[model samples]
Target: PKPPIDLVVTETTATSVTLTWPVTYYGIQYRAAGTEGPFQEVDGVATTRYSIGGLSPFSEYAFRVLAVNSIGRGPPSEAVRARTGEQAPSSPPRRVQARMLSASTMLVQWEPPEEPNGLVRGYRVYYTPDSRRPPNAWHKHNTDAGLLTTVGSLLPGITYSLRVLAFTAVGDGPPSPTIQVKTQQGVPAQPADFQAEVESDTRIQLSWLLPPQERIIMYELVYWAAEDEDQQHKVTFDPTSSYTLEDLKPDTLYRFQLAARSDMGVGVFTPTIEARTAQSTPSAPPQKVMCVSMGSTTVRVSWVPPPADSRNGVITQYSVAYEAVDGEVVDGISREHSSWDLVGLEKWTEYRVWVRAHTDVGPGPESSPVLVRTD
Candidate 1:
């Protein structure tokens, strides 16, 4: 016989579809729509009309009809598409999670449900204070189309119970298992407007505004020298709004961070701030001062700068002073040069010479006087 033609979908339901063909001894062939597959067949039906049961809800399927005779099966008719009606989802959303973002804000997130049964249009997040009350009234927030939402305006220091449900055009699916989140106490926020000022070679003034929620009772300061970070220092003190760090290395760059602490706990620290101590005059005298006579009328003077730690700033110059024993004194200054010559000295005269280092701030203590004789 010829293949059946003009297949018509007569009706549809959540799990079944009724169809009719031009004629039969008919067989039905169907597969999920928009898929490549070996079709499922229902053979040996005597009537032109047939119904397919045991189909998934809200799903599209392609169907075709065939006629048969004693010689065997005929080619199938053109395929037609039909969709089953929508029904409520059968499973809850998966991998639900809840986190506390602040003292009174909560963030809830989840993946889509395993068996939505239809297009997922939105989600409902249900939450309540977990007071363990029998009449625990629940509150709900509907998120129009995303997987995550922020629920705010909650009480601080309280625990909450939360769950999520997926919804389709038909209705809501089951909710996820309950998730618990505990809001934080009024821990202070990060220290704001932190600043540093170099007061002197050995002191730095640090100040900041107390973080919001003035419940702050104390503060913590952490600092380290930029050149040597291994030797970090920390200080904990009651709230004073300002602090002066003393006994710090002179002319050294330092990194600092401040954290405010409330009665409950310490808040986050401020971002690192960098500042350098003010430069000061050298702390010690020049080293190894020596005077040598050069023929008649001249003497040479040489010395080394102070130790690295004692040279509080760059050595800008050297001051060399000399006096003939029981005679007039002569003073001269030299650039960063470590050696200098003193001339116009009386021949066969004895003199005492002294050397000192100078910084932009001022000069340091003088080295021990040394005696030399001019020829």
Candidate 2:
């Protein structure tokens, strides 16, 4: 006699299904598509389950079974019908976004579907030079399993298309919408060109050209006198593209350079440039230099020029150079023949004073030394 009739549908895939039933000591025959008479019987030693492979996804199927023994086949079991699961999604995600943080780096992110039928293992991100090209040809990145967000690294500065896919234990699902994005390039390597124009004897104008294909946010200009030590001069400009360096000494050489900065990085510094102020007319030097008085801790100095001299004009400035009778040399300033307060000397110490006058051309020759003793 035939075994008892029992049926169940188990594992289902895009292209196949496995059906299971109770085992019978006798045997069974399988049939499909309503064909009769040429029945093929299953051996009793085989397991109770059978897998039907090679069926199309999403297609309908019907199955029935009949038990058999040495006595002959028994009555057919009840008919059952089922459909295979659909194939994984083929389309990829859309609308990816990208932003460049540096010359050789970019940050990439995307969005996925709000609702899905199966669990997502992770996303498969793909990129290519052209969006029209096939997706299989693009570079693929498998992000964290079941993650909806990820960051892509080491991308070139160019336009590209990005897509994402959903996956399950069985296989990968359909792709999300594709997004178009473009990475940004880094800052320029070369510095801007700079030039200086003398606006006046004591003023200068500076101007520079912007770097090519670069969005310059700001510029930095630094200036200093060639003779001034310790970098004593400094100024910053924020108003216009160019600035007038003012309040400079006449006929003096000033050095300057320019720098440009942007969101990417600071550009290279421009070549250093120098400009000289206009020269003034000639002037004369003072005649005689002397130490007129002496005190317990100070000395008075004085000087005079000859009443009439054709070669020397009026003196513009004067300088005083002094040395202790047996100590190191020190310098001081006096625009004319007069005494200056000298302190910190030994009560009976001897000192020497040397005076010199400055004309429009340059500093004059030093006068004869005058010796004095502190009372």
Question: What are the per-residue Cα lDDT tens digits for candidate 1 across 1-375?
Answer: 688777888888889898886333788988986677888989888988888899998778888887888777788888887888888888999888887776568888889888888888999888888646532368888997588999989755457888889999999999888888643466777777899988998899999875444787889999999989888989999888799999987789999988777777776567799999888888899888777887899888877779888988888877767666566633336555878778788888887777888788888888878888888
Candidate 1 scores a C-alpha RMSD against the true structure in Å of: 12.4
CA error at residue 155 for candidate 1, angstroms: 26
Question: In candidate 1, residue 42 scores what lDDT?
Answer: 94
- Model 2 C-alpha lDDT per residue in residues 100-179, reported as the tens digit of each score: 45433445665554433334456777766688788799888777653344444543334566666765455676666676
State the displacement of the C-alpha of residue 62, model 1, in Å, after optimal TM-score superposition. 30
Please list the Cα RMSD from the true structure of every candidate, rounded to 1 decimal place: 12.4, 14.4
Positional deviation of residue 54's Cα in model 2 after best superposition, in angstroms: 3.1
Global lDDT of each candidate: 0.82, 0.61
> How high is each candidate's TM-score?
0.53, 0.32
Residue 271 error, candidate 1, Å: 1.1
Best by TM-score: 1
